[PDB]
Structure 1
Amino acid sequence: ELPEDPRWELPRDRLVLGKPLGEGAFGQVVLAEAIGLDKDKPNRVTKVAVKMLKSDATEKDLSDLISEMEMMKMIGKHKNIINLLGACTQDGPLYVIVEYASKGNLREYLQARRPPGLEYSPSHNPEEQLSSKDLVSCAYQVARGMEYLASKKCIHRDLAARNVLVTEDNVMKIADFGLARDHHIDYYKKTTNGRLPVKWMAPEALFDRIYTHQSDVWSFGVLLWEIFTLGGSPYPGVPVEELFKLLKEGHRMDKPSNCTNELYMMMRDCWHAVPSQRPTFKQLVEDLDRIVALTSNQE
């Protein structure tokens, strides 16, 4: 039996379970409506994402979901992270209730707003479109959320655009920052979408399994490269073995088109071979804040 925590407990009948959002082994995510989540009124419905376990789920899968919930409790609230909203822990399956981000992950969000398909792409007529000031703003918000997490002593370890979520009002929220330990990462495994996670990893994290905030800043570099190529895939066609060798030689990704030199030097700085020489999230937040204000939105 799980102990109740009246800070977070929502009665079960206050939650109407809706359509799935996400799969699978790592815990199913469904859309729901919570009645009367907040103090008052109890008469208002909030759309939430609810995390749960699947059918043939183990005790270890249960243990991880709890740990991720408790971790969110300790970390506290920020505008640029997926916040914990509630939990149903008693008399049934465990539900962890978290903020809903209705535009999905940043990679998807970036890809969907790419300019229309030409003869040589071809009918990708998006309904929506991001200026240069919008793109630097995405980076500012992710850096803000990361700075907040680092100040709470949290190391993400898998920062990437797939783990940044986008709300209906276009606010970036970092997801998956409370996920459990896991000495057992296999470099060969892919994402659903076909990409290798080793490609956001700092060399020291990759080779010596040293995970720090500095290593997260390495991942934010690649995230910056993802925002500025509008969801471009890092090192496409490069297998893990060849990636090892590009890292060893000090290879660094090319500068995206429609990226200022200043922003590309930011990427490069984040990718400094020496971890102590990278900027901090605090420095990146100051820098981006300045650049945003100077970045024209007219294009």
Structure 2
Amino acid sequence: LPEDPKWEFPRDKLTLGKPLGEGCFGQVVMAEAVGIDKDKPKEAVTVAVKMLKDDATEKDLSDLVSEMEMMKMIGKHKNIINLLGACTQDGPLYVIVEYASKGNLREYLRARRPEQMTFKDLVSCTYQLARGMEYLASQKCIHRDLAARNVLVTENNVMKIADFGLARDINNIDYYKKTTNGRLPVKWMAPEALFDRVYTHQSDVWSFGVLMWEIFTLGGSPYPGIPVEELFKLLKEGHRMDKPANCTNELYMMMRDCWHAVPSQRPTFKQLVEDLDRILTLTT
């Protein structure tokens, strides 16, 4: 692993704590980092640390390195989980990231189902994530794994995109290759990502529409009752999810535009941000 002093953090100033989540690419633990904020070199900050599991594979390590590099290239934004540092030399690979105390968005929403959530809160949540994707797209980055489970909520109820393990630069896609997009969850995936084996920002817009549906169902599971094996046939025939109850007609029409069959006819993240900003302002 090449040295990157800009992002390197000393191992002796990092103390691992309770585990936060345990998936399949790795594990995440809460930790205390002393001096991670360079202006406060003696203060210990609570952070999250992603590392490999004991049964990790070679691909797991390459995915973790790719995720680290992508978060280095992306840059800083209010609605993106902030990379804080990395332990990469002489020991296990640790990726140190900002700690979001309220967990992922799906559980956050499902827990606040009848501090209950209002319509304004859901619109504000959607606007924040639209902004986050607009910034990502401006950096020529495609997320490819947009979903409520991959959004984190901070103590101040700020929404952060996270889990960049599948994210790629817009030009770093093997177009029309049979293996391309094979590790994307099918119920959040744009049809062309599987029918044509391409991925653009308009594919992310589709996923964002699915994310919107998750948000206004307060954490519902997309395409309820429809197994993955039958979904894509129905999508080819024009099936789309019905309007959630807590949604306005205008927001559902926005979801359906995100789900246009023709990618170029879907809205861009900039248009989504403008429309959501108008809607959120009117709600005041």
TM-score by length of 2: 0.92
SS at match of 2:166: coil
2:135 corresponds to 1:148: yes
Which of 204, 209, 225 pairs up with 1:237?
225
Q: Structure 2: how far apart are the matches of 1:113 and 1:92?
A: 41
1:100-146 deviation digits (Å, cap 9, x = unpaired): 1111111111100011xxxxxxxxxxxx1111111000000111110
How do 1:1-299 and structure 2 match up within 5 A? Answer: 2-115=1-114, 128-179=115-166, 183=179, 197-296=185-284
Give, in whole Å, the separation in 1 of the partners of 2:22 and 2:273.
Answer: 33
Could you tell me which amino acid in structure 2 is paired with residue 225 of structure 1? W
Q: Does structure 2 conserve the Cα–Cα contact (< 8 Å) formed by 1:31 and 1:47?
A: yes
Equivalent-residue separation in structure 1 for 2:62 and 2:239 (angstroms)? 40
What displacement does 1:184 show? 6.7
Partner letter of residue 164 of structure 2?
A: F
* SS, match of residue 66 in structure 1: helix
Q: What SS class does the counterpart of residue 18 from structure 2 fall into?
A: strand
**Which residue identity does 1:159 align to in structure 2?**
L
In structure 1, distance between residues paired with 2:19 and 2:128: 27
Matched position secondary structure for 1:199 = helix
Q: CA deviation at 1:178?
A: 4.6
Task: Please tell me whether the aligned partners of residues 154 and 177 of structure 1 are also in contact (alpha carbons under 8 angstroms).
Answer: no
Contact 2:181–2:193, Cα closer than 8 Å, also in 1: no
Which range moves more in the overlay, 196-205 or 128-137?
196-205
How many residues in Structure 1 have an aligned counterpart in Structure 2? 275
The residue number in structure 1 matching 2:176 is none
Q: Could you report, residue by residue, the CA deviation over 1:239-290 in whole angstroms, capped at 9, with x for unpaired residues?
A: 1232122101101111111211111110111111111011000110111011
| SS of structure 2 residue aligned to 1:205 | helix
- Give CA deviations for 1:167-202 in whole Å, capped at 9, x if unaligned: 111110001235367917668xxxxxxxx9211111
Change (3 A) 1:246 1:59: closer
Give the stretch that moved more between structures: 229-238 or 173-182: 173-182
SS of the residue corresponding to residue 47 of structure 1 reads strand
Tell me how far 1:40 sits from its aligned partner. 2.0
State, as a whole percentage, how many aligned pairs show the same letter: 87
| Structure 1: gaps of 5 or more residues | 116-127, 188-195
The amino acid that maps onto 1:175 is A
Whole-angstrom CA distance in 2 between matches of 1:71 and 1:221: 24
Taking structure 1 as the reference length, what is the TM-score of the superposition? 0.87
Q: Tell me, what secondary structure is at the counterpart of 2:141?
A: coil
Q: Counterparts of 1:227 and 1:12 in 2: how far apart (Å)?
A: 38
| Residues 223-251 of structure 1: CA deviation (Å, up to 9, x unaligned) | 11111111111112211232122101101
Equivalent-residue separation in structure 2 for 1:269 and 1:215 (angstroms): 12
